[PDB]
Every structure is written in structure tokens, then in C-alpha cells.
Amino acid sequence: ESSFVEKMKKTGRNIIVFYGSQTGTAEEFANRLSKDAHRYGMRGMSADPEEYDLADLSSLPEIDNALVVFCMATYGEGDPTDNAQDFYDWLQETDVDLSGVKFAVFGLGNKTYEHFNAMGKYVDKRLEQLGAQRIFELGLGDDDGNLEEDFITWREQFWLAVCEHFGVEATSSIRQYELVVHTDIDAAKVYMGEMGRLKSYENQKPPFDAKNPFLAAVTTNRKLNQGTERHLMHLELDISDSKIRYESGDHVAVYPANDSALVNQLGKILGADLDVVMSLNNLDEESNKKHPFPCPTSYRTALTYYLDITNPPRTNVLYELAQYASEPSEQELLRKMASSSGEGKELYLSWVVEARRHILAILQDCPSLRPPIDHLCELLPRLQARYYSIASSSKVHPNSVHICAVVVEYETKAGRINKGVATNWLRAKEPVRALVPMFVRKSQFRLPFKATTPVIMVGPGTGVAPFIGFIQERAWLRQQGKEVGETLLYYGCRRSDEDYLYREELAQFHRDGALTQLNVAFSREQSHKVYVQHLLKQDREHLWKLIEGGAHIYVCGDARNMARDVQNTFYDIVAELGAMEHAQAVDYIKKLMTKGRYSLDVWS
């Protein structure tokens, strides 16, 4: 059915929760809200807007007590997720009267970005402009703090508002899927970790994307730093014959595999035979989501390629697990963590989040907790792809995508050693054949259209990644006999003799004349910190001349602190030498952003 309204009528639902999601968080929130409906005598369904036509919103009044909720994540430059693009485009062009429509919006965002929760804000603003009635205030989830707590707090107030407005009242853990063990299946009919189509990893056919990743051979995987302290690496993935295209500035996404050792420990503590092949089937026969991940598959495969077993669990997982803890003290600890406040919340933020306890850690520190592996597989979120800023230029390496990454490994307050999923998996890839499932995601981060336009690149640490590609390209341009403007790199590391990435490559680019200036800040070679913004300030005169002349600024790397400090430094450069007020310099820099002359590729 094309009309979600007709689907709702046919399936007896009065609440529909649409999700704008890229890495599954919004989808999970939408599913959790949909399931909540039953507690109020209502019935809901979650839905991917891309599968429908939101113009059908005007028909919602045909369903009694109809309510629509939107859980929307914001991405690149305050834009909608890919699956919410058509909806976004519709909202911009429509002027339909939505009188009679009742809605609520929960936005997923992160305050370290320039356009915080821009999508949620827009949807909430537009629906009101069109005439719809807001049932509860816009939720502003912030992943820079604790998105989960923002969500359960909003969710609680939301349902209270629903009860008050619709005159309904609140009324044991309900499985969404049922287990079927495939004891006699053909080995060839079993998923072994591929995404989407069965055997798609073995039988590789284009086009390659998120649902059909291209298995690229690792031609190179080399250590970039010295100490055994940290591990920074440079990988080169062969994309020959994939027809995949990219440009410096784009991101490469990879689908990792969890640590075999961690999976084995989970299997043992759960007393489950991980080699058992099974299928989890949706009890709702009318849902397009037939299984929680590719099935049939073994528990080992699911825990290795399909499920997230490392991220500290969200509160609904802990609440559902509580029923399987036989020790009273333990069961109470788990149940309490779903509280939106009080000791339950403090314990969740401290025992789970701050201590970075993953599922095995939780099962180990609550030994009486012994959940059935199949239910656990239904509760855990899907293992997501990780993004890396491509460190190569397609003008120089059209058949290879390079990655510059730092391995994640640290000790927790709970006395454990946590290892980042994608980085440790990538580190273990032996150069030619080791294959990496990947795809390219286009970005707006790009070199200037005119080669003569100067570029100011700021990227300390792994933030230097896209700029290695930028420099390669600018060098290539000069070799093509083209006039290229100044190319400046502001880089930084802790110590020149420990973590100075691409030291020799950058030095050669500078000797060649391709890299006009190589400005490096060594943060730990003095008592006080020396950062890239310190170097930018010292170079204020030249930078202002370039900015005034039309130069493009690029900032890549840490979003929580570096990006903000650097932006503040540029505000000062403009205010001081542009002879304008600080507030005018702020407007100036933000305007450069709208013109594509101040670009960001930051992350946490």
C-alpha cells in the first residue's frame, strides 16, 4: 500500500511514528514510541517516510484519535537524512492545509555542530505553519550530552500530554520476534555476515552502496606513528572494477566485525552454542521488517557482523534484561536504570555510561543475569558502519580510497580494556587478500571550483585526513600546468617525534611547492599547550588578506573543542583586521559558511 493512512486503517493503528535515521538511532526511538502506544489502549506502527508519501498527512483526520510523531536526526549542514529527503522537499514546496492533524516531534542532534537539530526544528515549525496542532513541545535531543536521557525524559512528558489531550490512560515484556532454529538448513542458504542480498559479498555485482557494500582489498595498511602507546594507521583500499567514484572530501564507510574473543566470551557466559543457525521472525506479519538482521544466520555471525555488543546499552535494554537477573539486588539495579531521574538515572549514567560497560561487562558484573541469547539478539541495536574522511584524491588515485585513522583502546573505571570496533578490526587487516566491506558517501566538503582560489586547511591529529587528498590534488593540478593559488595547512600533534602523521609526505609536498605553507603546532613540547589556533592568530595578517581575497577555509577533526576554538580565532581575525565588531565578524564567518567558503568535517 502506498498510503500510510490506508495502511493504518487496515492494521488498526491510530499512531504512526516516522523516523529520519542514518545510523539507526531515530529508528529505534520511533520503534520504542510505537510500542508504547499499547500501554495507553492505542496502537502504533513505526515507518520509514521514504516508503510513503507524506502528502497523505492531510488524510490522517479520517482515523479516529490519529496522532503522528516524527523522530528526526539532523545531518550534514543541518540537512535531513537521506530517507527523509523527499519529506523535506515536500515540506518546502507544499502549502496544504493540515488543520486537524495532531503531531509531536523529537529531534536527534548534537550541539557541537553548527545547525543543532535543524531538521527537527524545521519539521516542527513547518507542520505548525501548515495548520497542524502540536500535541507536545519539540524535543531537542543532544548526543553531545546524553541523547538517551533526553529521549526518555521527553517520552515521559509526551505520553502524559497524549493522555490529557485524548482522554486515555495508562494500563510484562513483549517479544517482537519469535525464534525458529534451522537445524537442517543448506550451508549456502545461511547469511555469513553480508548485508542485504544473500551471497552478495561472494557474488559482487554493482552498483555498490550501503545495502550492497563493495569488498575492497587492503593493498596497504601501515603504522604512521612511533610509540607503542597509540596506533595511527594509513590504509589503502582497492576499488578497482567497482565503478565507484569519489572526490577528496567524501567519506568512506566501512562495515566492521566485532572482536572474535569478545563474541566467544559472550557465548560462554550465556551458555549458548554460537554455531546454532536460526531465524528471528517478526510477530507482526504485516510489517516489512521481517527479521532484526539478515536471517537465517548463526548466533556467532549475528554477534560478529550484525549486532552492536560494545556500546553502553540504552535504558530499554537494561530494563528488559532485568527480568533475567535472579539476584534481587541485581534485578533492582537494572530495573531502576530506566528512571528519567533520581538514583536510577544517576546509576545508569555512572554504572553504564561513565564506566563504559558493554553487554559482556554488564553480564559479568551482574552474574545472576542469564538472558536467553535469542532475546538478547532482538534487544541489541544493529552494528553500524563507521565513517572515515577519504585521505586520497581521485585525480591521483581513482582506483583506491585511503584512510587515516587512530585506533581506539582505553581502560575503563570498571577496570576493563575497551577496544574500538572498526579501528581494531581495520588494524588487523593484512595487506595483500584481506577484504573490507565499504561504500562512498558524498559530502559537500570540496576544493574550490577555481584552482586559483587559495585554501586554508586546519586539521590537527587525524583531522589531517582529507587534506592529504586535497594536497595531492593541488599538486596534480600544478603538474597539469594549471595556475594554483596558495595552499596552506595548519596541522598539529602532541610531539614531533611521536605522532606526527605523514611527516615525510607533507615535507616533500612543501619542497615541491605544492604545499605553500606547513604550519605545525606541537601541543606537548612545552609546559603550555600550543594549538593550531595559536598559529592562526600569529598569521592573522596573511590569513585576513587571503580571506578578504576569497580564500576557502576548511576545518576537520575534533568537534567538541578544536572546531569551536578555531572558529572563535577566525572571528577574532576578522574582527581585528576587518575593523568590525565581534558580532559582525560572527555574521561574516557564518556567511562564508553559506557561501561554501568555510567548510567543516568534524566529529566526536
Ligand X SMILES: Cc1cc2nc3c(=O)[nH]c(=O)nc-3n(C[C@H](O)[C@H](O)[C@H](O)COP(=O)(O)OP(=O)(O)OC[C@H]3O[C@@H](n4cnc5c(N)ncnc54)[C@H](O)[C@@H]3O)c2cc1C
Ligand Y SMILES: NC(=O)c1ccc[n+]([C@@H]2O[C@H](COP(=O)([O-])OP(=O)(O)OC[C@H]3O[C@@H](n4cnc5c(N)ncnc54)[C@H](OP(=O)(O)O)[C@@H]3O)[C@@H](O)[C@H]2O)c1
Ligand Z SMILES: Cc1cc2nc3c(=O)[nH]c(=O)nc-3n(C[C@H](O)[C@H](O)[C@H](O)COP(=O)(O)O)c2cc1C
How far is 323 from 332, CA to CA, in rounded Å? Answer: 10
Minimum gap (Å) between residue 73 Cβ and ligand Z: 3
Q: How far is the CB of 499 from ligand Y (least distance, A)?
A: 6
Q: Does 311 bind ligand Z (CB under 6 A)?
A: no
Site for ligand Y in 494-553 (CB under 6 A): 494, 523-524, 529, 531-533
Instruction: Say whether 25 counts as a known binding-site residue.
Output: yes
Residue 28: strand pairing partners: none
- Position 235 contacts ligand X (CB under 6 A): no
Angle among Cα 501, 463, 239 to the nearest 5 degrees reads 80
Nearest in space to 298 (alpha carbons), one of 175, 177, 191, 180: 191
CB-based closest residue to ligand X = 420
Rounded Cα gap, residues 68 and 47, in angstroms: 11
Site membership for ligand Z, residue 116 (CB under 6 A): yes
Residue 505 vs 565, nearer CB to ligand Y:
565
Calpha distance 97→436 (Å, rounded): 49
- The answer to whether the annotation marks 95 as part of a ligand binding site is no
Is 292 one of the binding residues for ligand Z (CB under 6 A)? no
343-372 residues in contact with ligand Z (CB under 6 A) are none
> Annotated catalytic, 556?
yes
Q: Which of 44, 49, 80, 109 binds ligand Z (CB under 6 A)?
A: 109
Active-site residue identified among 425, 556, 558, 599: 556
CA 498 to chain centre: 30
> Does 265 sit near Ca ion (CB under 5 A)?
no
Give yes or no for residue 465 binding ligand X (CB under 6 A): yes
529 annotated as a binding-site residue: yes
Minimum CB separation of residue 26 from ligand Z in Å reads 3
CB of 158 to ligand X, least distance (A): 27
User: Any idea which residue has 542485504 for its cell?
Assistant: 196
598 is in an annotated binding site: no
The four Cα atoms 133, 137, 142, 148 give a dihedral, to 10 degrees, of -100
Dist CA 321 CA 292 (whole Å):
18
What are the DSSP calls for 90-139, one per residue? Answer: HHHH-----TT-EEEEEEEE-TTSSSTTHHHHHHHHHHHHTTPEESSPPE
* Per-state percent for the chain, helix, strand, coil, to nearest 5: 40, 20, 40
Q: What is the β-pairing status of strands 552-558 and 598-603?
A: parallel
CB-neighbour burial class of residue 93 (10 A; exposed 0-12, middle 13-18, buried 19+): exposed
Q: Which stretch binds ligand Z (CB under 6 A): 109-117, 130-138, 154-162, 321-329?
A: 109-117
Binds 485, which of Ca ion, ligand X, ligand Z, none (CB < 5 to 8 A, cut-off by type)? none
Is residue 392 close enough to count as binding ligand Z by CB under 6 A? no
Q: Does 115 bind ligand Z (CB under 6 A)?
A: yes
Report d(CA 189, CA 199) in Å as an integer: 9
Contacts of ligand X in 271-330 (CB under 6 A): 310
Count of other CB atoms within 10 angstroms of residue 507: 12
Of the residues 238, 250, 374, 601, only one is catalytic, namely: 601
Identified binder of Ca ion from the candidate list 157, 323, 519, 568, rule CB under 5 A? 519
Q: How many CB atoms lie within 10 A of CB 106?
A: 28
Residue 587 interacts with ligand Y (CB under 6 A)? no
CA pair distance 401, 465, nearest whole angstrom: 12
Q: Which is nearer to ligand X, 408 or 434 (CB)?
A: 408
CA-based diameter of the chain, in Å?
78
Stretch that binds ligand X, among 38-46, 387-395, 473-481, 547-555 (CB under 6 A): 387-395
Tell me the closest approach of the beta carbon of residue 144 to ligand Z, in angstroms: 9
Concatenate the DSSP letters of all residues of 426-482 into one string: HHTPPP---EEEEEEE--S----SSTTS-EEEE--GGGGHHHHHHHHHHHHHHHTT-
Least distance CB 3 / ligand X (angstroms)? 35
Interactions with ligand X, residue window 469-528 (CB under 6 A): none
Could you tell me the three cell numbers for 479? 603538474
- Please name the amino acid found at residue 205: K
Residue with Cβ nearer ligand X (313 or 420): 420
Under the binding rule (CB under 6 A), the answer on residue 460 touching ligand Y is yes
Query: Is 311 marked as binding a ligand?
Result: no
Residues binding ligand Z: number (CB under 6 A): 22
| CB burial readout 456-481, b (16+ within 10 A) else e | bbbbbbbbbbbbbbbbbbbbebbeee
Considering only residues 410, 413, 444, 549, which one is a binding residue for ligand X as defined by CB under 6 A?
410
Q: What is the footprint of ligand Z within residues 39-98 (CB under 6 A)? A: 73-76, 78, 81
Task: With H, G, I as helix, E, B as strand and everything else as coil, classify residue 491.
Answer: strand
Residues in the chain followed by a break, C to N above 2.5 angstroms: 171, 432
Of 58, 242, 279, 389, the active-site residue reads 389
Check whether 153 is labelled as a binding-site residue. no
353 contributes a contact to ligand X by CB under 6 A: no
Query: Is 90 assigned a catalytic role?
Result: no
Distance (Å, whole) CA 77 – CA 444:
9
The answer to whether 85 contacts Ca ion (rule: CB under 5 A) is no
Footprint (CB under 6 A) of ligand Y, residues 232-251: none
- Exposure string of 137-155, with b = 16+ CB inside 10 Å and e = fewer, is ebbbbbbeebbbbbbbbbb
Active site residue 377: no
Q: Which does 565 bind (CB under 5 to 8 A by kind): ligand Z, ligand Y, ligand X, none?
A: ligand Y
Among candidate residues 118, 124, 91, 92, the one with its CA nearest the CA of residue 105 = 124
* CA–CA dist 418, 262 (Å, integer): 10
Q: How far is the CB of 456 from Ca ion (least distance, A)?
A: 12
Q: Is 405 in the site for ligand X (CB under 6 A)?
A: yes
State yes or no: is 601 an active-site residue. yes
Q: What's the min distance (Å) between Cβ of 386 and ligand X? A: 4
What residues form the annotated binding site for NADP(+)? 230, 462, 523-524, 529-533, 565
What residues form the annotated binding site? 21-26, 73-76, 108-117, 143, 230, 356, 386-389, 404-406, 410, 420-423, 462, 523-524, 529-533, 565, 603
Footprint on this chain of ligand Y (rule: CB under 6 A): 406, 460-462, 492-494, 523-524, 529, 531-533, 561-562, 565
Footprint on this chain of ligand Z (rule: CB under 6 A): 21-26, 73-76, 78, 81, 108-110, 113, 115-118, 143, 147
Footprint on this chain of Ca ion (rule: CB under 5 A): 519
**Catalytic residue numbers?**
389, 556, 601, 603
